[PDB]
From Swiss-Prot, chain B:
Component of the 19S proteasome regulatory particle complex. The 26S proteasome consists of a 20S core particle (CP) and two 19S regulatory subunits (RP). The regulatory particle is made of a lid composed of 9 subunits, a base containing 6 ATPases including PSMC5 and few additional components. Component of a complex with USP49 and RUVBL1. Interacts with PRPF19. Interacts with TRIM5. Interacts with NDC80. Interacts with PAAF1. Interacts, in vitro, with the thyroid hormone receptor (in a thyroid hormone T3-dependent manner) and with retinoid X receptor (RXR). Interacts with ERCC6. This is 26S proteasome regulatory subunit 8. Component of the 26S proteasome, a multiprotein complex involved in the ATP-dependent degradation of ubiquitinated proteins. This complex plays a key role in the maintenance of protein homeostasis by removing misfolded or damaged proteins, which could impair cellular functions, and by removing proteins whose functions are no longer required. Therefore, the proteasome participates in numerous cellular processes, including cell cycle progression, apoptosis, or DNA damage repair. Belongs to the AAA ATPase family. The chain holds residues 20 to 51 of 406 of the full protein. It comes from Homo sapiens (Human). It comes from the Eukaryota. It is found in: Cytoplasm; Nucleus.
UniProtKB/Swiss-Prot annotation, chain D:
Signal peptide: none annotated. It comes from Homo sapiens (Human). Component of the 19S proteasome regulatory particle complex. The 26S proteasome consists of a 20S core particle (CP) and two 19S regulatory subunits (RP). The regulatory particle is made of a lid composed of 9 subunits, a base containing 6 ATPases and few additional components including PSMD1. Interacts with ADRM1. Interacts with ZFAND1. This is 26S proteasome non-ATPase regulatory subunit 1. PC repeats lie at residues 195-228, 233-266, 268-302, 303-337, 339-372, 373-408, 409-428. It comes from the Eukaryota. Component of the 26S proteasome, a multiprotein complex involved in the ATP-dependent degradation of ubiquitinated proteins. This complex plays a key role in the maintenance of protein homeostasis by removing misfolded or damaged proteins, which could impair cellular functions, and by removing proteins whose functions are no longer required. Therefore, the proteasome participates in numerous cellular processes, including cell cycle progression, apoptosis, or DNA damage repair. Belongs to the proteasome subunit S1 family. The gene is PSMD1.
UniProtKB/Swiss-Prot annotation, chain E:
One of its GO terms (cellular component) is nucleus. The chain holds residues 283 to 376 of 376 of the full protein. GO terms for molecular function: structural molecule activity. This is 26S proteasome non-ATPase regulatory subunit 13. Belongs to the proteasome subunit S11 family.
Curated annotation (Swiss-Prot), chain F:
Residues 8-143 form the MPN domain. This is 26S proteasome non-ATPase regulatory subunit 14. It comes from Homo sapiens. Component of the 19S proteasome regulatory particle complex. The 26S proteasome consists of a 20S core particle (CP) and two 19S regulatory subunits (RP). The regulatory particle is made of a lid composed of 9 subunits including PSMD4, a base containing 6 ATPases and few additional components. Within the complex, PSMD4 interacts with subunit PSMD7 through their respective MPN domain. Interacts with TXNL1. InterPro entries: JAMM/MPN+_dom, JAMM_MPN+_peptidase_M67A, MPN, RPN11_C. Keywords: DNA damage, DNA repair, Hydrolase, Metal-binding, Metalloprotease, Phosphoprotein, Protease, Proteasome, Ubl conjugation pathway, Zinc. Zn(2+) binds at residues 90, 92, 103. Component of the 26S proteasome, a multiprotein complex involved in the ATP-dependent degradation of ubiquitinated proteins. This complex plays a key role in the maintenance of protein homeostasis by removing misfolded or damaged proteins, which could impair cellular functions, and by removing proteins whose functions are no longer required. Therefore, the proteasome participates in numerous cellular processes, including cell cycle progression, apoptosis, or DNA damage repair. SMART domains: JAB_MPN (SM00232). A motif (JAMM motif) lies at residues 90-103. The gene is PSMD14. Belongs to the peptidase M67A family. PSMD14 subfamily.
Length: 286, 32, 32, 428, 94, 287
């Protein structure tokens, strides 16, 4: 399909000022803008973005307005500036995927045959990586519905170019960074992974106990799609697994022990060098 | 009675002397 | 004057710890 | 205590053998509860002794903060009819105790003694004695001023040398080396004329004899010059005359800013209002200068913030702190925040633990100006009683800070924590 | 039916449950391995069919409660051992 | 009638777009117009920036048909913030970060519209990862030298917080114009967004790499550490008695023991204890 998408930090920083632009009310302001990139391979990159207006009601999830004329006008404008970038999709600043967004994607799919969308957390109060990405497919089911359009996930990450990296590093002078120090930030990565796993399992438990206790219909899929999760988690108290685990733990501990032994004599060398070069110097000086 | 009040400050002075000896190494490393 | 000898020794002992705590912060940040 | 009172009343030398106990119990001390518990049994031995010395009870009492105790000793002293030992603590309380403590004990000690009550209240004769000592025993030089007359620039050296001259003549009421020339005092473009007008305030310090007519040569409604900044500096100088003396002058500045004008004169008037009422907590001053804060101008922020921090000096009222902390987050300026930092720092005046939570709610905030406000609050909340908790936070949270902007005012907060014992402060 | 603790099933219970003969069992499970619902392997020396994977099926409410209980059993230990790494390392992870 | 202790605020997107457009036209000078407002009489805020089609020569860069600029500033009013054009910027690659003879020519034209017009000079060549070279200049009247340009009622924009350079002092600096001090204002919406664009989700944190490559990597590092320590033996045991003041002068060649040992200690320990810790986490978290 499209494999994975790369976001340059000019986008996802242009989004937050768009939320600061007309997010004065700040209740259900789903700010929508249009991406700009270049599918140079199956892998994709996006670099620029601009604005389109949008108003919709809290209820009545069918009333909305994507501006055709602003899209064509500012596309011609940015083509008069930048002839390399072509439109790839859109971003909405909703914290979760909505119900009427597929109508927006089906409307804008005339300009782009595979219009990806990027959910960007403007206020990421949950820990993790923002800017997830979705694309539209057909999910023909055996239930009886012919087809629907309910998207699916594509892997995403924040990339970098050789000039924007300078800017985002210089603007990161209000935070201490311990990334240079090793054997510490890996442990923080382990802690962050544990917290993310806890948050995802809490969400799964919340949904499952919500649909379990009367409220909401029992979805006939997922409950057997998540059945294969529990068929995994192999037995830790297995004989050959423990027998191999200690066999490799000792092999790692040999290298750790030799590292301590090769560190201690260097420390002793520095000690006796300092003591001799100090005592002879004070013999001369006194 | 009073010699207790001597020996307590003897131990505290030993601790103070040891820490003041230890601090100068860190002062030298900071200076470098 | 033995009371003043005891408390000044107790003063400098708990005050030498704030020097030994502040330097270890400074020597750690000066690497970065 | 229990046996401590018997031991201090066990037969010994009633001079400093039993008077060093107070000093070596007040200099080194853990907390506030045990300090008051050991201090409450010193007024006893100083009072029920056959020779109760009256002058060395005020330093016991000001930490005791009891209006009924000083009321009791003055009630036992008025009917004794010994004026040699009667006014002396009423001058001691003016010399050391807080203005709030005085103004909260005059109605206790007032509801002969009339001039004595005036003596503790106003201190006009004490200010007059200080002024007379300064004018008679006066040895000001002027040759070094003529040496500094060589330095010529559009900068400080010809525009802010007037403030440097004013320190040499602070309180002396002799501006004869300033009115020597008038061509020298016209070299600035509307910002050092503010200092040139404000410099007349520090010359006549405590000049209650020289009222409004002293500066009637330079007033907003007397001469009305082409530059209104002279008129703005006049009210600033008038406020600088009456430091902690908010009588008629505070009412004149209260109705002066009631029909105020553009913010240049309002800056000087608000600074005069803030300086001439510090530690008074007057509500009219507070809301009149809170309208100044809500005027939303980036020239009035230093005009209003320092004033609203000055009138509520250590009052720790919830309204001022949770108004100005909340206001100092949404204003997109710089002078408002810069004048608000010291102002919200001044609502704390050494409350020790009582000012903890605000600091923990502010020192962590993302605003760098609020971080410097937090360091000034750490400087003021634990002033005097240098404890390793406050020193440790002060010398940790900005000695390794990502921003330089707070770090220049970081260790500058140290010098208010260690002035009691400056023996080892240069060592650290 | 068995909860993956002893997933291996002997041939005797296969021939008793499915009422088929002794020598006809293996082709039968080969037929299962022909289609793809079953992903096991067969050991003939001990005559036991080891099990790896079973295709999912429909589940009801009590099974969903049991699944939620097992998921909570897994959900507690994540927090409980994150407390282990966070509590025994303060100034490394800072 | 006074130029006070001024200040310029720049937003994050403005600086990022500034550096990207400066790098994208690296050998010549690129153009641009700034979008912002005068928040007060003291400070000037720039909240956005945008670029135009240009036409560049070897030594000069000119604009094109300005119906682009008029229609762009008309259309940007419709979506969100309707600011004004408070200033202009260009680039000076490999130059002295200074206003040239023709750079100051159009500054009069930009200042004739509004008094508080700010020029901005960026450079993507001398800028490095930790610090971007940036400057803002304000044109001063070349007719008034006898008076003061800014009274400096305080000590903000002075030798305080910044020092004037040498190459700026050659081509102009405090002559014909002056400099202003830049600070960065960061709103909380972008503040708690900018500090988290480096992490990954939980699959990166809990992942053992592989054990075959880990064993081979440890084998290789120990194998080279053998010969490195064998060289270290001769390096210690020689130690010719003549004071390191020249032993650091015979070390300037290809000699390498005592220096590569502790690096190998670091890359061994910080890659072994992390893997063992993650192995324990994986083997008792999931169960």
């Amino acid at each position: 399909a499209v494999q994975k998408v790369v976001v340059h930090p000019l986008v996802l920083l242009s989004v937050v000022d768009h939320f600061n632009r007309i997010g004065k009310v700040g209740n259900q302001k789903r700010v929508v803008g249009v991406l700009l990139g270049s599918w140079q391979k199956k892998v994709l990159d996006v670099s620029n973005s601009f604005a389109v207006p949008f108003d919709e009601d809290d209820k009545d999830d069918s009333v909305w307005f994507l501006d055709h004329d602003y899209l064509e006008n500012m596309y011609g404008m940015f083509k008069k500036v930048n002839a390399r970038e072509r439109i790839v999709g859109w971003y909405h600043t909703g914290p979760k995927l909505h119900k009427n967004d597929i109508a927006i994607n089906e409307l804008m799919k005339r300009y782009c045959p595979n219009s990806v969308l990027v959910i960007i957390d403007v206020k990421p109060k949950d820990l993790g990586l923002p800017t997830e990405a979705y694309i539209s497919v057909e999910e023909v089911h055996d239930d009886g519905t012919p087809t629907s359009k309910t998207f699916e996930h594509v892997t995403s990450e924040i990339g970098a170019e050789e000039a924007e990296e300078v800017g985002v590093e210089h603007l990161l002078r209000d935070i201490k960074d311990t990334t240079v120090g090793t054997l510490s930030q890996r442990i923080t990565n382990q802690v962050h992974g544990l917290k993310g796993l806890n948050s995802k399992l809490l969400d799964i438990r919340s949904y499952l106990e919500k649909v379990a206790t009367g409220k909401l219909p029992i979805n006939h899929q997922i409950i057997y799609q998540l059945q294969d999760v529990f068929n995994l988690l192999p037995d830790v108290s297995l004989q050959e697994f423990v027998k191999a685990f200690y066999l490799k733990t000792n092999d790692q501990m040999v290298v750790v022990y030799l590292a301590s032994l090769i560190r201690s004599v260097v420390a002793l060398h520095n000690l006796i060098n300092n003591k001799i070069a100090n005592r002879d110097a004070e013999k001369k000086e006194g | 009675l009073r010699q207790y009040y001597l020996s307590k400050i003897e131990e505290l002075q030993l601790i103070v002397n040891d820490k003041s000896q230890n601090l100068r190494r860190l002062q030298a490393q900071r200076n470098e | 004057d033995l009371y003043s000898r005891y408390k000044k020794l107790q003063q400098e002992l708990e005050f030498l710890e704030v020097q030994e705590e502040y330097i270890k912060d400074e020597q750690k940040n000066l690497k970065k | 205590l229990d046996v401590f009172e018997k031991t201090i009343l066990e037969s010994n030398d009633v001079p400093g053998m039993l008077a060093y106990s107070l000093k070596l119990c007040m200099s080194l001390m853990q907390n506030k509860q045990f300090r008051n518990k050991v201090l409450r049994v010193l007024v006893k031995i100083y009072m029920n002794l056959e020779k109760p010395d009256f002058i060395n009870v005020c330093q016991c009492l000001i930490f005791l903060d009891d209006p009924q105790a000083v009321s009791d000793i003055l009630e036992k002293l008025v009917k004794e009819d010994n004026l040699l030992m009667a006014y002396q603590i009423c001058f001691d309380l003016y010399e050391s105790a807080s203005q709030q403590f005085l103004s909260s004990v005059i109605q206790n000690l007032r509801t002969d003694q009339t001039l004595k009550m005036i003596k503790i209240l106003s201190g006009e004769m004490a200010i007059e004695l200080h002024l007379q000592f300064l004018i008679r025993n006066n040895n000001t030089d002027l040759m070094i001023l003529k040496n500094t007359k060589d330095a010529v620039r559009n900068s400080v050296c010809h525009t802010a040398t007037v403030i440097a001259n004013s320190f040499m003549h602070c309180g002396t009421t002799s501006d004869q080396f300033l009115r020597d020339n008038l061509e020298w005092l016209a070299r600035a473009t509307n910002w050092a004329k503010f200092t040139a007008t404000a410099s007349l305030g520090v010359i006549h310090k405590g000049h209650e004899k020289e009222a409004l007519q002293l500066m009637a040569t330079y007033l907003p409604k007397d001469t009305s010059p082409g530059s209104a900044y002279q008129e703005g500096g006049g009210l600033y100088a008038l406020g600088l005359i009456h430091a902690n003396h908010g009588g008629d002058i505070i009412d004149y500045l209260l109705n002066q800013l009631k029909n105020a004008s553009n913010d240049i004169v309002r800056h000087g008037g608000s600074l005069g209002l803030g300086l001439a009422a510090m530690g008074t907590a007057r509500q009219d001053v507070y809301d009149l200068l809170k309208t100044n804060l809500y005027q939303d101008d980036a020239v009035t922020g230093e005009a209003a913030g320092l004033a609203l921090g000055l009138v509520m000096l250590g009052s720790k009222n919830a309204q001022a702190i949770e108004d100005m902390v909340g206001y100092a987050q949404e204003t997109q300026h710089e002078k408002i925040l810069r004048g608000l930092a010291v102002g919200i720092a001044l609502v704390m005046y050494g409350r020790m633990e009582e000012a903890d939570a605000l600091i923990e709610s502010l020192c962590r905030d993302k605003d760098p100006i609020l971080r410097r406000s937090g360091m000034y609050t750490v400087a003021m909340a634990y002033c005097g009683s240098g404890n390793n908790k406050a020193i440790r936070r002060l010398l940790h949270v900005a000695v390794s800070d990502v921003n330089d902007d707070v770090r220049r005012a970081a260790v500058e907060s140290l010098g208010f924590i260690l002035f009691r014992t400056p023996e080892q402060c240069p060592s650290v | 039916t068995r909860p993956a603790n002893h997933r291996q099933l002997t041939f005797e219970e296969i021939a008793k449950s499915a009422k088929i003969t002794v020598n006809e069992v293996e082709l039968l499970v080969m037929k299962a391995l022909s289609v793809g619902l079953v992903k096991g392997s067969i050991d003939e020396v001990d005559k036991r069919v080891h099990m790896t994977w079973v295709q999912p099926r429909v589940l009801d409410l009590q099974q969903i409660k049991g699944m939620k209980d097992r998921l909570e059993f897994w959900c507690t230990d994540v927090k409980s051992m994150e407390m282990l790494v966070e509590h025994q390392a303060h100034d490394i992870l800072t | 009638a006074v130029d006070t202790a001024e200040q310029v605020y720049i937003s994050s997107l403005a600086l990022l777009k500034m550096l990207k457009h400066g790098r994208a036209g690296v050998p010549m000078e690129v153009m641009g117009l700034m979008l912002g407002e005068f928040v007060d009489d003291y400070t000037v805020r720039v909240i956005d920036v945008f670029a135009m089609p240009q036409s560049g020569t070897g030594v000069s860069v000119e604009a094109v048909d300005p119906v682009f600029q008029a229609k762009m500033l008309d259309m940007l009013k419709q979506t969100g913030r309707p600011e004004m054009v408070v200033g202009w910027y260009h680039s000076h690659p490999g130059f002295g970060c200074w206003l040239s003879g023709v750079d100051i020519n159009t500054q009069q034209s930009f200042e004739a519209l509004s008094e508080r017009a700010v020029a901005v000079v960026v450079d993507p060549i001398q800028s490095v990862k930790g610090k971007v070279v940036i400057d803002a200049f304000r044109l001063i009247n070349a007719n008034m030298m006898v008076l003061g340009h800014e009274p400096r009622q305080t000590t903000s924009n002075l030798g305080h917080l910044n020092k004037p350079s040498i190459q700026a002092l050659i081509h102009g600096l405090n002559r014909h114009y002056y400099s202003i001090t830049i600070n960065y204002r960061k709103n909380e919406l972008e503040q708690k967004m900018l500090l988290n664009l480096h992490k990954k989700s939980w699959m990166e944190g809990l992942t053992l790499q592989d054990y075959s490559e880990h064993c081979k990597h440890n084998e290789s590092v120990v194998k080279e550490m053998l010969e490195l320590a064998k060289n270290y033996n001769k390096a210690v045991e020689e130690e010719d008695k003549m004071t390191p003041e020249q032993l650091a002068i015979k070390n300037v060649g290809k000699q390498d023991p005592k220096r590569h040992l502790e690096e190998h200690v670091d890359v061994l320990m910080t890659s072994n204890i992390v893997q063992c810790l993650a192995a324990m986490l994986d083997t008792v978290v999931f169960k």
